[PDB]
UniProtKB/Swiss-Prot annotation, chains A, B:
Keyword Hydrolase tagged: yes
Reaction catalysis annotation: a triacylglycerol + H2O = a diacylglycerol + a fatty acid + H(+)
pH-linked activity: Active at alkaline pHs (up to pH 12 approximately).
Transmembrane segments: none
Keywords: Cleavage on pair of basic residues, Disulfide bond, Hydrolase, Lipid degradation, Lipid metabolism, Signal, Zymogen
Gene Ontology process terms (BP): lipid catabolic process
UniProt GO molecular function: triacylglycerol lipase activity
Family that this chain belongs to: Belongs to the AB hydrolase superfamily. Lipase family.
Record-annotated disulphide pairs: 22-268, 36-41, 104-107
Name of this protein: Lipase
Species of origin: Thermomyces lanuginosus (Humicola lanuginosa)
Keyword Membrane applies: no
Catalytic center residues: 146, 201, 258
Length: 269, 269
């Protein structure tokens, strides 16, 4: 259903997100080769990939992650880590929508996450633009898992439209706001956002559509189970805003599913 | 380089060992189907397997585990859980011997795995005698990962001799005694020991061959990496008390390889 080529990119950014959690990237220097504990990012390891700037608890929300240069894949990857302790971070999630208009008219975006990027935007936007300058032939991708995901999406739609495309790969990201917004992220150019989800991952269930939230389109939904290897013949395009048969199926959800996107993610052996 | 039937048994007992850490298994009413959280033990979930005796923290060594009635596989399984933090248990690992002539004359063992077992030995011997009575033709199998492995092994060697074979499958087990214990465990009667190791796993290399400890033979080595699916082709039979060319290689150990035996084990998603 999804192309071998999209499958590799999905896999690779899953590893870049997982690397945000695992091995020597929580804080660190510049130029460092990227490596992960417990085989958590082999495809990144296999690439000529190097740190550009590493961050932590940046601004009001606690923003942690890195900016990488991948000479093999021709990339500049900004990766946002999610929470240190997920189950905590889960129950505490305020269903609250602050209007997004700067980013788009009539739109609505989650106060916690919406407020979280602004906190840091200028100090990193800068650091990206700089890299863009050095390798203007390189594709800018922002990725992230969980809280890291949400950030990426917010950093992305935000910082888009200054001349350089911004792809986003989110793995197990939650809703960031409203049906207008959703429609925005769906047709907004200069970056194709790829919202990846798994089975009944609890994160992209929240917040609910019952609370006026919605998700952008399409959604990429991994139907293979937890700990199960992923093949490109297990990933389905759920095109149509909030179409069902997706992470939005009617049924009951789970956390171990949040930790399995292609490989182990948001935790570290 | 092992048979298929052998592979399935490896895999089922890895799940059975996993379950000892994960699921609603830690204490539940007898007769309830055995289950786990985070896709830990699906082949055990597939079977008609219920708990017989549930325990945890019992013993003078906080010994944790379960006895399990498997109608589908026609087995009686006794499963021992490892430490809750394999690190604070690797770190704190005391290597002092003790006499174990009850098991085998001359043999000396780790005062720790011996004593925690000795304390639960009567009470658990009894409970297996009831299921063996209840099911004379069922296979008694003792299993465990990490510490669990070790205990299981020290149980097997000890309870063999009552008129029923006791097979042992340990996963990433530590070395358990001197050269006398080994040989007893390499050629002893009344049940086969299947000692499974993965790559550069750490615990099977402890305690050192230079604190008076040695390995039972044979060894079934898993060559596939951490977070990599296991095939019959990725297991290799390593022959010989303390042989090398498997796990017992002069290289640098790895905690995460210990946490992957056919699937996730030693931790829960």
């Amino acid at each position: 259903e999804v192309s071998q080529d999209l499958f590799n990119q999905f896999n690779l950014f899953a590893q870049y997100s997982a690397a945000a959690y695992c091995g020597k990237n929580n804080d660190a220097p510049a130029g460092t080769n990227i490596t992960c504990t417990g085989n958590a990012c082999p495809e990144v390891e296999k690439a000529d990939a190097t740190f550009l700037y590493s961050f932590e608890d940046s601004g009001v929300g606690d923003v942690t992650g890195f900016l990488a240069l991948d000479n093999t894949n021709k990339l500049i990857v900004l990766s946002f880590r999610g929470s240190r302790s997920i189950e905590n971070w889960i129950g505490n999630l305020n269903f609250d929508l602050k209007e997004i208009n700067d980013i788009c008219s009539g739109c609505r975006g989650h106060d916690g996450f919406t407020s979280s990027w602004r906190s840091v935007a200028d100090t990193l936007r800068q650091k990206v633009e700089d890299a863009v300058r050095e390798h203007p032939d390189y594709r800018v991708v922002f990725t992230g898992h969980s809280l890291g995901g949400a950030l990426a999406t917010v950093a992305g739609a935000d910082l888009r439209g200054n001349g350089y495309d911004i792809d986003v790969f989110s793995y197990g990201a939650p809703r960031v706001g409203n049906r207008a917004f959703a429609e925005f992220l769906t047709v907004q150019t200069g970056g194709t956002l790829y919202r990846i989800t798994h089975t009944n991952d609890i994160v992209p269930r929240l917040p609910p559509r019952e609370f006026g939230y919605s998700h952008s389109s399409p959604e990429y939904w991994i139907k293979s189970g937890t700990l199960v290897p992923v093949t490109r013949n297990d990933i389905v395009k759920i095109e149509g805003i909030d179409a069902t048969g997706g992470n939005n199926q009617p049924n009951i959800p789970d956390i171990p599913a949040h930790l399995w996107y292609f490989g182990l993610i948001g935790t570290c052996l």
